Amino acid sequence: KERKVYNDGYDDDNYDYIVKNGEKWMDRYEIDSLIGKGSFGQVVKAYDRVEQEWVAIKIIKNKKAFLNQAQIEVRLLELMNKHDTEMKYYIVHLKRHFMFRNHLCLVFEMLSYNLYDLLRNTNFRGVSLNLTRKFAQQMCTALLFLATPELSIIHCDLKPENILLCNPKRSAIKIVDFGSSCQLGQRIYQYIQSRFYRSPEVLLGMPYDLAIDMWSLGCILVEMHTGEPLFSGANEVDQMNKIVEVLGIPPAHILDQAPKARKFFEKLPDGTWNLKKTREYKPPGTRKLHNILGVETGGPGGRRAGESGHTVADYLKFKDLILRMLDYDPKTRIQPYYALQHSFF
Numbered sequence: 001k002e003r004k005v006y007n008d009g010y011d012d013d014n015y016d017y018i019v020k021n022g023e024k025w026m027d028r029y030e031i032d033s034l035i036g037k038g039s040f041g042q043v044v045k046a047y048d049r050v051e052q053e054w055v056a057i058k059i060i061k062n063k064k065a066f067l068n069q070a071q072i073e074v075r076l077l078e079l080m081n082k083h084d085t086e087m088k089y090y091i092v093h094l095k096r097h098f099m100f101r102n103h104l105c106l107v108f109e110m111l112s113y114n115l116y117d118l119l120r121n122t123n124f125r126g127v128s129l130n131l132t133r134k135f136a137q138q139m140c141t142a143l144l145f146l147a148t149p150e151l152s153i154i155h156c157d158l159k160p161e162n163i164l165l166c167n168p169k170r171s172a173i174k175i176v177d178f179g180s181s182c183q184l185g186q187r188i189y190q191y192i193q194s195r196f197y198r199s200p201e202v203l204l205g206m207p208y209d210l211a212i213d214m215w216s217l218g219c220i221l222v223e224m225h226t227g228e229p230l231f232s233g234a235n236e237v238d239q240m241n242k243i244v245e246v247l248g249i250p251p252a253h254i255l256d257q258a259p260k261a262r263k264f265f266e267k268l269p270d271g272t273w274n275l276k277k278t279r280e281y282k283p284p285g286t287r288k289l290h291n292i293l294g295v296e297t298g299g300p301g302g303r304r305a306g307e308s309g310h311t312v313a314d315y316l317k318f319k320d321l322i323l324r325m326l327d328y329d330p331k332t333r334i335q336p337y338y339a340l341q342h343s344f345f
């Protein structure tokens, strides 16, 4: 048993800052309360008294490992907010960044609840399709911003919790984290994406480009509408098997290049790639998207039968776009410039 002291009693046992409600930092920020928690540190509600506006401050952990990755986050956010378009307004704003009590603190604008909270407020019955489209148009517009040849940034951690609403009355969304993010060509890590939204490329261990965020986005949109994660795998092997359930066995010309192909599959004498031997999963390809989305049934789960805009022809556009995002081959996966012009918008 250890009751040591951690950073003069300002830090906890886990490199975080022991947030106390009502603190007045420096002589400017009034820490209201805790907002969110994560591997990076914490997020707090605070009032920037000098500018009389509300801000969300990201208290990075007090460890050189987390403080070095957060500095790459500052550089990317600073680099993104410098470029003059009207798309950088789909990315959360980094107002300023300062060191306080050995924690690197990032001052963000205040956004509202995350897409998962929006999903929980609907008791996981899913948002309407037209609203699912709105998030799709915005995310694809935002994924284009990161694919700017001067940026070339991969988020690597796309998930509902990292897409926040601007106002609690819906529609306007922004991306928020960018801690586990690297620019193309400056890659570093191979265990990058959140399991539910990991691409087959990272699962097989092959080199990845910006196309991995499109895979996550596809899995995000279907989850937003259905209420359940599409590929709700409990571990890496359960993940790849739950992907081949829908999209079938990956192309042989990928597994032949895949370093970690042996982990899930095995090459037969025929040359045909097949799953490893052992029943737990439906035979590859039988869990079709046609039924997950319920195009010709009554929407997902029969809960969208007899509503506006949930046309059978509308779903066929949605189903086509999703399978265009989940193309297993990143060199043929849909790109945001071509995704926005899809017949779904």
Ligand SMILES: CCN1CCN(C(=O)Nc2cc(-c3cn(C4CCOCC4)c4cnccc34)ccn2)CC1
Binding pocket: 035, 036, 037, 038, 043, 056, 058, 092, 108, 109, 110, 111, 112, 113, 114, 161, 162, 164, 176, 177, 178
């Ligand atoms: C009316 C009350 N309501 C308003 C405030 N609200 C917010 O969520 N505000 C907020 C959060 C972030 C923000 C959240 N995460 C985490 C991501 C992982 O999941 C946990 C949160 C960030 C990571 N990296 C940078 C910024 C963030 C940024 C701006 N504003 C909740 C409470």
